[PDB]
């Protein structure tokens, strides 16, 4: 048999498999907005 | 704005509180309630505190405005349900900006109990269903229920 190195370590690296991943944005589960009908004290629907 | 009016009992429409300075909210409860002032002013200065960049004294001074639903007001219980839906929405909102020390439930309890008194007088407000629908997203369940109560809002 061949005396293979135990490849317990990454030096290639997997960075081709890594930066291909586009990372989710899940900071706030309702998508980063406070959902409120009271804090719209203002409205652009008025003129103009 | 930066100073709106606080009406008196006798020779009303005379005194003002300028909001550029920050008075303590508890003495505000006093200087309002020795004057038997209408509940609307409590909402108005709550909005003043909120536009002053305050979310916590804003939400706790209104707890002192939960006592005076119809004190001398001649059926301003519509004004009390408007008061109480603000706490039913902003307790659960301030629970989402939770800190390292308290629990989410440390505000959800007060939100849920006060919502029960909010539904004693009035049912299916445009914010009643919001409070329980946004209550659902916190726990990851009753999610289609939350969507249904939001669609109850559109109908």
UniProtKB/Swiss-Prot annotation, chain A:
Determine the domain of life of the protein's source.
Eukaryota
Q: Where in the cell is it found?
A: Nucleus
The protein's job, in short, is:
Component of the PAF1 complex (PAF1C) which has multiple functions during transcription by RNA polymerase II and is implicated in regulation of development and maintenance of embryonic stem cell pluripotency. PAF1C associates with RNA polymerase II through interaction with POLR2A CTD non-phosphorylated and 'Ser-2'- and 'Ser-5'-phosphorylated forms and is involved in transcriptional elongation, acting both independently and synergistically with TCEA1 and in cooperation with the DSIF complex and HTATSF1. PAF1C is required for transcription of Hox and Wnt target genes.
Listed under subunit, the entry gives: Component of the PAF1 complex, which consists of CDC73, PAF1, LEO1, CTR9, RTF1 and SKIC8. The PAF1 complex interacts with PHF5A. Interacts with POLR2A, TCEA1, SKIC3, KMT2A/MLL1, SUPT5H, RNF20 and RNF40. Interacts with UBE2E1. Interacts with PINT87aa which is encoded by the circular form of the long non-coding RNA LINC-PINT; the interaction enhances the binding of the PAF1 complex to target gene promoters and may anchor the complex on target gene promoters, sequentially pausing RNA polymerase II-induced mRNA elongation. (Microbial infection) Interacts with influenza A strain H3N2 NS1 protein; the interaction interferes with host cell gene transcription, specifically with that of antiviral genes.
Q: Which family does it belong to?
A: Belongs to the PAF1 family.
Protein name per Swiss-Prot or TrEMBL: RNA polymerase II-associated factor 1 homolog
**From-to range in the entire protein, with total length:** 50 to 97 of 531
Curated annotation (Swiss-Prot), chain B:
The TPR repeat ranges on this chain: 39-73, 127-155
Role according to the record: Component of the PAF1 complex (PAF1C) which has multiple functions during transcription by RNA polymerase II and is implicated in regulation of development and maintenance of embryonic stem cell pluripotency. PAF1C associates with RNA polymerase II through interaction with POLR2A CTD non-phosphorylated and 'Ser-2'- and 'Ser-5'-phosphorylated forms and is involved in transcriptional elongation, acting both independently and synergistically with TCEA1 and in cooperation with the DSIF complex and HTATSF1. PAF1C is required for transcription of Hox and Wnt target genes.
Q: Where in the cell is it found?
A: Nucleus speckle
Tissue and organ distribution: Widely expressed.
Q: Which residues of the full protein are shown?
A: 3 to 157 of 1173
| Subunit-level organization | Component of the PAF1 complex, which consists of CDC73, PAF1, LEO1, CTR9, RTF1 and SKIC8. The PAF1 complex interacts with PHF5A. Interacts with KMT2A/MLL1. Interacts with STAT3. Interacts with SETD5. Interacts with ERCC6.
Q: What is this protein called?
A: RNA polymerase-associated protein CTR9 homolog
Species this chain originates from: Homo sapiens
């Amino acid at each position: 048999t061949y005396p293979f190195d135990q490849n317990r370590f990454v030096q290639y690296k997997a960075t081709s498999l890594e930066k291909q991943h586009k990372h989710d944005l899940l900071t706030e589960p309702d998508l980063g907005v406070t959902i409120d009908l009271i804090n719209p004290d203002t409205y652009r629907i008025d003129p103009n | 704005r930066g100073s709106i009016e606080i009406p008196l009992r006798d020779t009303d429409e005379v005194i003002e509180l300028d909001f550029d300075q920050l008075p303590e909210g508890d003495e505000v409860i006093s200087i309002l309630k020795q004057e038997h002032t209408q509940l609307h002013i409590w909402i108005a200065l709550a909005l003043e505190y909120y536009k002053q960049g305050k979310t916590e004294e804003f939400v706790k001074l209104l707890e002192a405005a939960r006592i005076d639903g119809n004190l001398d007001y001649r059926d301003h219980e519509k004004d009390q349900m408007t008061c109480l839906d603000t706490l039913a929405a902003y307790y659960v909102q301030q629970a989402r900006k939770e800190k390292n020390k308290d629990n989410k439930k440390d505000l959800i309890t007060q939100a849920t109990l006060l919502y029960t008194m909010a539904d004693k007088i009035i049912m299916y407000d445009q914010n009643h269903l919001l409070g329980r629908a946004c209550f659902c997203l916190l726990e990851g369940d009753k999610m289609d229920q939350a969507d249904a109560q939001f669609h109850f809002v559109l109908n």
